[PDB]
Amino acid sequence: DSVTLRLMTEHDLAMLYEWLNRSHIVEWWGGEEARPTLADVQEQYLPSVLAQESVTPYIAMLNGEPIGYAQSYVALGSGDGWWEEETDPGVRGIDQLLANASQLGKGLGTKLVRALVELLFNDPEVTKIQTDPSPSNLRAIRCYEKAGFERQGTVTTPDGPAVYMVQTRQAFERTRSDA
Ligand SMILES: CC(C)(COP(=O)(O)OP(=O)(O)OC[C@H]1O[C@@H](n2cnc3c(N)ncnc32)[C@H](O)[C@@H]1OP(=O)(O)O)[C@@H](O)C(=O)NCCC(=O)NCCS
Ligand SMILES: NC[C@H]1O[C@H](O[C@H]2[C@H](O[C@@H]3O[C@H](CO)[C@@H](O)[C@H]3O)[C@@H](O)[C@H](N)C[C@@H]2N)[C@H](N)[C@@H](O)[C@@H]1O
Ligand SMILES: [Ca+2]
Ligand SMILES: [Ca+2]
Known part of the structure; x- marks a missing residue:
């Protein structure tokens, strides 16, 4: 059914800790910080701490169950x-x-990304959404493409080379109807 987003709260941190230590997630999430301890997740993902980095955490919901984690960030406001x-x-x-x-691989990630993109463009100040999957992460890249993102090129980030992908507000508008 429909994937929705709610703000993550401090009450979700134990659950997020469990998630971040699942093998399918560790593979693509963490980097130096892969397999965080409970304290790590409590210290790093508390919504008020993420707020200091211009990061907003969400829990993805499907049929009243939490099924994933997402975050949006102000790019100009990111860490060094x-x-x-x-x-x-x-x-x-x-x-x-x-x-x-x-x-995984059943279209749920595409639904989640589409829901996040829609949420973000419902802030009229937002001009463009970006994402930066690892070049190794072909599944994530395809999911993003299915959700309307376009590959731009390779960029150097603190987490290594990434495939910079974007979806502009104009693109989102054009693709809302076949009219
Ligand atoms: C990335 C993620 C959110 C994508 O969600 P998903 O539901 O698995 O993706 P979808 O099923 O919606 O779309 C994935 C697409 O990639 C293709 N694909 C699947 N596995 C693939 C693989 N191993 N290599 C390349 N392409 C793959 C699928 O065929 C599908 O495309 P298609 O519909 O044209 O056939 C999810 O897999 C995930 O959370 N993975 C672990 C964490 C992660 O990688 N996060 C992203 C970091 S940038
Ligand atoms: N796309 C998956 C990746 O997401 C996160 O990295 C994002 C990173 O997130 C930082 O990491 C913590 C929360 O994950 C906060 O400190 C944010 O600053 C963000 O600051 C950058 N602007 C974009 C990065 N892609 C993960 N950190 C990373 O391990 C994972 O591979
Ligand atoms: Ca405003
Ligand atoms: Ca149109």
Whole structure:
């Protein structure tokens, strides 16, 4: 059915910790910080701490069950080394994961990304959404393409080379109807 988003709260942190230590997630999420301890997740993902980095955390919901984690961020407002060429404060980036190995490759990630893109463009200040999957992460790249993102090129980030992908507000508008 329909994938929706709610703000993550401090009450979700234990659950997020469990998720971040599942093998299908560890593979693509964490980097240096792969397999975080409970304290790590509590210290790093508390919504008020993420707020200091211009990051907003969400829980993805399907049929009343939490099925994944997502975040949006102000690109111009990111940590040292991140998006240092950005000039547009309207640019938002996203990252996300599906909690359950059993639910991968069945279109749910595309639904989640579409829901996040729609949410973000419902802020009229937002001009463009970006994402930055690893070049190794072909599944994530395809999901993003299915959700309306276009590959731009390779960029150097603090987490290594990434495939920079974008979806502009104009593109989103044009694709809302076949009219
Ligand atoms: C990335 C993620 C959100 C994508 O969600 P998903 O529901 O698995 O993706 P979807 O099923 O919606 O779409 C994936 C597409 O990639 C293709 N694909 C699937 N596995 C693939 C693989 N191993 N290599 C290349 N392409 C693959 C699928 O065929 C599908 O395309 P198609 O519909 O044209 O056939 C999810 O797989 C996930 O959370 N993975 C672990 C964490 C992660 O990688 N997060 C993203 C970091 S940038
Ligand atoms: N797309 C999946 C990736 O998402 C996260 O990395 C994002 C990164 O997120 C930081 O990491 C913590 C929450 O994940 C916060 O500190 C944010 O600053 C963000 O600051 C960058 N602007 C974009 C990065 N892509 C993960 N950190 C990373 O491990 C994972 O591979
Ligand atoms: Ca406003
Ligand atoms: Ca149209």
